[PDB]
Write a protein that binds this ligand. Structure first.
Ligand SMILES: Nc1ncnc2c1ncn2[C@@H]1O[C@H](COP(=O)(O)OP(=O)(O)O)[C@@H](O)[C@H]1O
Ligand SMILES: Nc1ncnc2c1ncn2[C@@H]1O[C@H](COP(=O)(O)OP(=O)(O)O)[C@@H](O)[C@H]1O
Lengths: 457, 577, 52, 457, 384
């Protein structure tokens, strides 16, 4: 609550006698007007300390600068009472409803659990789509990345399938007793426009009535921004991990994760190693895709989903490298795809959930899915060859057998991949594949077994 | 404010002392002249002296006086028609009181205290006002310029003068508090204007550019951006933007714009036809241009200076349209802070206030309804100037994720025959999705259809483009030059728009809309010409093809019937051959 | 073309990348060199502030 | 008097005992060998301050070092009295002829000018050659620097103007009543061979007349590479603006500029910023180049367009970066032609000035011109375009029509740039243009109108 | 001290066919010696001191390594003196710099040279200076920058780049000394690009204020292309002030026919690309003309052994001389092979081999084949 502030940079502020404080803390600071702002507790040395004002900066004076000690580490209140609440960045009551009932003020970062507990996520999951459930599904707790474009229909295709998602234990042989549906979404650096496109999907159909919001606009303060995700992130845990519910964490443009980052080191003196960024991102970032998985004994499992855009769609950047290193999959979007009108414009092989190849098929989703999942993959792409070779010979200039492998691709991207807002049940989604496969007389598919095709086909 | 003198003399930024409560970001006074300073850092009693204009005439121990509050820009009638620096200072008065060069120390009111603007008070004496509410109707050409009650100055009116002529200093409205709601009202720049509420952008904006409003448009006050290498028309490309296009209120400001790159709209904008008021656009235009050689820090004022004026109008429900002449120069100044401040270099060799002052400033105002009554939006596009032109420069990404509908500026593009000179693919748009409502009705219920199926080619045509750079017309088949050339002409006469032509400088829907069909037909007929067997060879030299390329130069008047006459010659001079 | 492509094309664009790269990676020269000097200052200031 | 010395070493000085001084002051430096120097009062401090020596502190010592504040801000002579004289970086008698008295010593710095004094460079001039007087056309008040590599015809061709530079009033309206010509040359690190060749271009053109220059030979200290510029740019503002002299001034060997510039970047204490060059470089090259543009209310216009050389074909060189923006327009040079024969070898593949498009075509010049330049531009582009695809696919491989495109490339270029001591008038130009366009009748010419197009066909 | 500076006047030719013939230089001016490792540079100085134009001989091998000059230095004592006959030491002085010489023993070792040239020059004698790999010395100062904490500039180097260099070039040049006698100080520095680094500043700024330069291709150095020079990117500005002595002693139809030869390989490139893309046979008659022309324009001109008593020395007599022999073929083959006959028959022309002694022929008994076969060119070939 002291005064005498020396050395002030932007939303930063130093204060002596910092032996009562400790890095990892925050308190509200008051200049002259007595305005209540804030500031994180950094460098608590003998001489002075380091604080980071919530707001941008304007409002710090030389005379007064006392501070009301909030709490070394602050954490929002957790509970099951948040089935439609709304919060931004830090995550404070903006939805109008009463301050969330605090159950336990857990650290926004409880770090990973016993690695011995962690199990392989293999509970099949639908998303109201075909292509994104057949060729590449998503297993419970599986941290699946989504390579998006920095200005692509991302923002949309994001929240689009968001609500579409629906967990189906039924097909496995269980009910929704221990398998509840919990939707958590948190963005950052959002345009005033977009900040409004979001709030829309929830209000659509029974979407917000079972979810909580979080998103620190880029114009907002850069402080809550970083942690912004960690909030509901650490909070989803109390859901599936503490009670055994089933949560879905979905990142959003880590552009923020790093832009915001730069400031921390840019001030903290944290020298940026490669690509002009902090020489300890891997680590700090790792702690991210760790909040997803499964433990021995608990069925409750939260599924994790990263989603970001590169600087110029360069995978050589951290934004991609990092992920493409810890994430168990890959799912990008191409200009091409969308240019023709494909929506969702999602490529084939370029996108795929690394660990959704085992949690499918027998018992899980559609027995024959086992081989069905690797059929349309090698079979489809096979046609993408006679797709750019028209100018070579022509339409009828090509054989029947291989030419046929063409009509497929077009009927495949236009109808199969571009599925817009539609919501295809995990089963309504598998059928389609079959249907398309009919192009080639029963006997041309070398991927699946004659057994399965000689039936579903 | 605070009262003290220079404590420790230094190059262009000194160190004052005896400073108490010198809050961060505050206007002040330094030097026995008027080199107004700003509290840009604190250290107990001393604060880092900020010097706007270059200092070559000052001594060790001179003026040092703050304010106590975050600056203070004086907004009010009389700001229109006249040159004004990035500090709301009318250079007109400078040239008139100094000479041919720009003398420093000279600073006069930014509002018209002398001039008497016919003020009209309609505030019922016996009620309470709120900062942001209308105060009456002020005469100011073919448009409407109300006077917002300074925010938080909500009191209780008690009288109302007659409707005659009252300056921005004379008593125009009074309240029970000893205050007076003059034609002007004090408001800080570092702080935005509390409007009534936030609104969604569903209305597309038009400026004549057939590359924006056509397929790549934004919002009736959204956010956008466009780079520009060393001399890419980005500076002047702001002429036919607010002049030709509709803009409730025009506001031009540029960061350190090369005197020569700044004298491109300085005298040109003056003779601009106005479709509402009539004469020069200089009727609503503000002009806040700032030459580079200008005080390196003025380069900063410029911005935070045009941001609030755009608001003061927007709140009232004025879709203010502001455009920054090369937003990149602000950066060279902003990061220049470091050199003079020896501040711990942030990442990317630039300052840390990336997001803090990028997104905050790039989203300050944008399509927001307020107490005014109408819906005031804000559409602004800073044209980054990448030194090497590198698209991965701090300023490039620094604006990314923040502003949609991004665009690129190639080098041989405008140098050749392409105008605007932007990247074909590299330039995509996401606002056009929800921009269909307005288009559907205005244009047609199937317009987003005739425009999306075309972009289908413009971006799919690449399918061959690539193979082209892999072989050429050698192994061309029949669908081959189909697209290639199609897209080809599409950029020579369809895309390139001579903004420097008689009328083509602007094109409406029926203009934009039709053309996009002119070719289409040929395409349609091309599909059965060659497929039937017709050799593209005679198809190539079709005389009517030359007709489809003289459509850009036509006006909205002649256009309608003009194209319809060829729409017949088409199916006729093709299906035939 | 196959051959050529394979020794001028392929290798033509290969060899490009290397030159770029090595300049690109080292490019982070300023990172260390600029920052190296940077520590000395921020600290010298805070190193001479505890000695005066 | 200031003897209280403190530090000496290189063009950098330091001394205490000076609690008074302002920014920018000319002092002296008495040495022990009896050799005094000047020195600018750069950044000042309370106890001491930063000194700026012109030449390298050779055999200098603090003890016996003596400084003397002569002035509080720079000025030097500034009358047109000394016309045709020889000076150096500084600006004083170095030719042998006794000194002379000026009018009033003023800071040649190059302060900013009012917006009313700025104008549109419409007053086109004859550049004694076509390449220019058509595509770019000289213009008083604009700026189109000349990109060069090394040894390139940066100087050789540059002279082409020294013999072929003259306005064309007759075509416009104003007469030769009030138009005096006064040149202000200013060198900054020039060779020895470059020394005499230049002067010999003053005796054959009649340039050695009416010339008030501050030659900075290469063997001159690097103190005058950015300093002389301001000195010279001001010997104009006095005769051009208040005396009505339409004075055109241009600098040479600006390749050495950024070097001296660079030193301050870090060799001082500030942040480099980009490519190893002073952060404020943008500005340091604004007040100088910004001193370009005609003036209304005063018939006095100064045209600046120095000539900077950049190692190898580097367009993104630190130099052209901001300079491009700064300068209104520009010109580019190609080695490919200066080594194959094309002489003068000049080609603005990207150079297309700025306000060259508005200032000729209607009235002064010939009707046809506005759409002409733009015509020739893309018209040629399409050409050489195949210059590559040609060297790849085959030799003749290509449609019979575009065949013409390339068939003329070599033409346009070879011929057009095959200019010589040719005075090439505004007209001798237009002609050629119509002579090369004749290879493809009105068909591809989609820039100019149907009338004009055939007009000169 | 020099009464006054003076422009270019007397030509400078070391006795190298191409080196001289393409990029000659005068006493006033300098040039750099590009070239990575093994690049002629380090010992070319052993090819430019043996026999060339100048009276005094001064060599200062800046930061030169031990062996990069071991034999070089000790070899001099074996050289021939045009004045007496014995080693060049009979009028020369060695100012070499050993690699191991401390940084400062190298950052000055050079200044000794140019200041020596002047003394002799100041007396009225043309002096020649040619510093090998100047990349050593550079490093010297290029490093001290780090030592005393200097502040680096572009590409991680010291700020004092061409700072002194630039001026070093000015002093260079034939300049009438205030010593009564004009003299003639000539300067020629050898900048060696360590790793074949063109982007090198000691290479990019060196030719910012200097005369011309000579680019040595690393690869060309392989086929005994001594000197490892290259035309691709090598130009000369001092080739416009030497024409006076050119057409003055040699001949008048020489300063021109020479220029008309560079085009050979000039116009040759544009064809080369495809030449190498398809096959050296898919061309019309006039096409193959310059097809195998250039090959000889070097094989027997550019390619010379700096060690071959005869060849190693080729003055103007050797230049213009053979410079015309091929010419003939041009005018001859253009019709000869145009007479229905294919150039193939012209390819076997055992008459070509004779012209192949254009370098292996006694510098003295040179006019023996000059005129001799001279006729055999327009004669026997006048039939096809
Ligand atoms: N709409 C346009 N079409 C073609 N050229 C234009 C257009 N607008 C501006 N230009 C040209 O571009 C040139 C250089 O751009 P400028 O705006 O001066 O630099 P910048 O905007 O990049 O800072 C101008 O000199 C002008 O000739
Ligand atoms: N011009 C030359 N081209 C190729 N080799 C040469 C040339 N001159 C001399 N040599 C031979 O190669 C050795 C080293 O060549 P040089 O290029 O001078 O050294 P460096 O290795 O430093 O490039 C000489 O000692 C000699 O044996």
């Amino acid at each position: 609550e002291y005064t005498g502030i020396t050395y002030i940079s932007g939303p930063l502020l130093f204060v002596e006698n910092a032996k009562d404080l400790a890095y990892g803390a925050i308190v509200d600071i008051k200049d002259g007007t007595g305005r209540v702002r804030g500031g994180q507790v950094i460098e608590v040395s003998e001489e002075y300390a380091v604080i980071q004002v919530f707001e941008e900066t304007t409002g710090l004076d030389l005379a007064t600068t006392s501070v009301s000690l909030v709490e070394d580490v602050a954490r929002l209140g957790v509970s099951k009472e948040m089935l439609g609440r709304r919060f931004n960045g830090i995550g404070k009551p903006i939805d109008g409803l009463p301050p969330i009932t605090p159950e336990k003020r857990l650290p926004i970062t409880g770090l990973p659990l016993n690695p011995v507990a962690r199990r392989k996520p293999e509970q099949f999951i639908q998303t109201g789509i075909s292509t994104i459930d057949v060729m590449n599904t998503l297993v419970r707790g599986q941290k699946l990345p989504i390579f998006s474009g920095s200005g692509l229909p991302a923002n949309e295709i994001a929240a689009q399938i968001a609500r579409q998602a629906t967990v189906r234990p039924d097909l496995s042989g269980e009910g929704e007793k221990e398998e509840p549906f919990a939707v958590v979404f948190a963005a950052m650096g959002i345009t005033q426009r977009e900040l409004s496109y979001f709030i829309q999907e929830f209000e659509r159909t029974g979407a917000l009535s079972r979810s909580v919001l979080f998103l620190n606009k880029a114009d907002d303060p850069t402080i809550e921004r970083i942690l912004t995700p960690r909030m509901a992130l650490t909070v989803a845990e109390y859901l599936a991990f503490e009670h055994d519910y089933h949560v879905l964490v979905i990142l959003t443009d880590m552009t923020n994760y790093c832009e915001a980052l730069r400031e921390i080191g840019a001030a903290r003196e944290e020298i940026p190693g490669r690509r002009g960024y902090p020489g300890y991102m891997y680590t700090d970032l790792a702690t991210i895709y760790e909040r997803a998985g499964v433990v021995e004994g608990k069925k409750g499992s939260v599924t994790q989903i990263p989603i970001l855009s590169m600087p110029d769609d360069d995978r050589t950047h951290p934004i991609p490298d990092l992920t493409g290193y810890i994430t168990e999959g890959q799912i990008q979007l191409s200009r091409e795809l969308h240019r023709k009108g494909i929506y969702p414009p999602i490529d084939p092989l370029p996108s795929l959930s690394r660990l959704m190849n085992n949690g499918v098929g027998k018992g899980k989703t559609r027995e024959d899915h086992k081989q069905v999942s690797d059929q349309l993959y090698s079979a489809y792409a096979n046609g993408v060859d006679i797709r750019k070779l028209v100018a070579i010979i022509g339409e009828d200039a090509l054989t029947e057998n291989d030419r046929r492998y063409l009509q497929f691709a077009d009927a495949f991207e236009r109808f199969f991949i571009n599925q817009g807002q539609q919501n295809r049940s995990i089963e309504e989604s598998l059928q389609i594949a079959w249907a398309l496969l009919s192009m080639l007389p029963q006997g041309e598919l070398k991927r699946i077994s004659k057994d399965h095709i000689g039936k579903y086909y | 404010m605070i009262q003290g003198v220079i404590q420790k003399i230094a190059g262009p930024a000194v160190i004052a002392k005896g400073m108490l409560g010198a809050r961060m970001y505050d206007i002040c006074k330094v030097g026995e002249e008027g080199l107004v300073g700003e509290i840009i850092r604190l250290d107990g009693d001393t604060a880092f002296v900020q010097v706007y204009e270059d200092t070559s005439g000052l001594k060790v121990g001179e003026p040092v006086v703050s304010t106590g509050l975050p600056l203070a820009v004086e907004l009010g009638p009389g700001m229109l028609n006249g040159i004004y620096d990035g500090i709301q200072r009318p250079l007109e008065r400078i040239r008139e009181k100094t000479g041919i060069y720009i003398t420093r120390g000279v600073v006069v009111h930014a509002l018209d205290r002398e001039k008497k603007w016919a003020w009209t008070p309609m505030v019922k004496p016996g009620d309470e006002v709120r900062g942001g509410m209308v105060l009456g109707t002020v005469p100011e050409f073919g448009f409407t310029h109300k006077i917002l009650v300074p925010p938080d100055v909500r009191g209780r009116v008690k009288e109302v003068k007659p409707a005659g002529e009252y300056t921005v200093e004379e008593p125009v409205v009074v309240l029970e508090d000893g205050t007076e709601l003059k034609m002007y009202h004090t408001w800080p720049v570092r702080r935005a204007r509390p409007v009534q509420r936030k609104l969604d952008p569903n209305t597309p904006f038009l400026t004549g550019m057939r590359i924006l409003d056509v397929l790549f448009p934004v919002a009736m006050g959204g956010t956008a951006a466009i780079p520009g290498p060393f001399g890419s028309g980005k500076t002047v490309t702001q002429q036919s933007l607010a002049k030709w296009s509709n803009a409730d209120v025009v506001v031009y400001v540029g960061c350190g714009e090369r005197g020569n790159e700044m004298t491109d709209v300085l005298v040109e904008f003056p003779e601009l036809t106005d479709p509402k008021t009539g004469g020069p656009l200089m009727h609503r235009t503000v002009l806040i241009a700032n030459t580079s050689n200008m005080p390196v820090a003025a380069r900063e004022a410029s911005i935070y200076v045009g941001v609030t004026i755009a608001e003061y109008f927007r709140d009232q429900g004025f879709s203010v349209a502001l455009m920054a002449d090369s937003t990149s120069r602000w950066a060279e100044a902003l990061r220049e802070i470091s050199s003079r401040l020896e501040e711990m270099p942030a990442e990317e060799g630039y300052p840390p206030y990336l997001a803090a002052r990028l997104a905050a400033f790039y989203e300050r105002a944008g399509k927001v309804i307020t107490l005014g009554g109408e819906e005031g939006a804000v559409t602004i596009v800073g044209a980054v100037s990448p030194p090497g032109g590198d698209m991965s420069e701090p300023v490039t990404q620094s604006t990314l994720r923040i502003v949609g509908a991004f665009w690129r500026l190639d080098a041989s593009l405008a140098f050749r025959r392409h105008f605007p000179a932007i990247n074909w693919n590299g330039s995509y748009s996401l606002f056009t999705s929800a921009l269909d409502p307005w288009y559907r009705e205005n244009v047609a219920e199937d317009y987003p259809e005739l425009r999306d199926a075309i972009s289908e080619l413009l971006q799919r045509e690449a399918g061959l483009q690539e193979i082209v750079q892999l072989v050429g017309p050698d192994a061309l088949q029949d669908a081959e030059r189909l697209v290639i050339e199609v897209g080809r002409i599409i950029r020579e006469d369809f895309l390139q728009q001579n903004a420097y032509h008689e009328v083509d400088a602007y094109c409406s829907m029926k203009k934009a809309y039709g053309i996009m069909k002119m070719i289409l037909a040929f395409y349609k007929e091309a599909e059965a010409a060659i497929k039937r067997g017709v050799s593209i060879d005679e198809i190539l030299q079709l005389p009517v093809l030359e007709r489809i390329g003289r459509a850009r130069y036509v006006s909205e008047e002649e256009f309608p019937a003009y194209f319809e006459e060829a729409m017949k010659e088409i199916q006729g001079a093709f299906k035939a051959l | 073309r196959v051959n050529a492509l394979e020794q001028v094309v392929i290798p033509g664009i290969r060899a490009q990348i290397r030159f770029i790269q090595q300049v690109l990676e080292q490019r982070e020269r300023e990172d260390t060199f600029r920052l190296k000097r940077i520590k000395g200052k921020i600290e010298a200031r805070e190193a001479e502030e505890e000695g005066g």
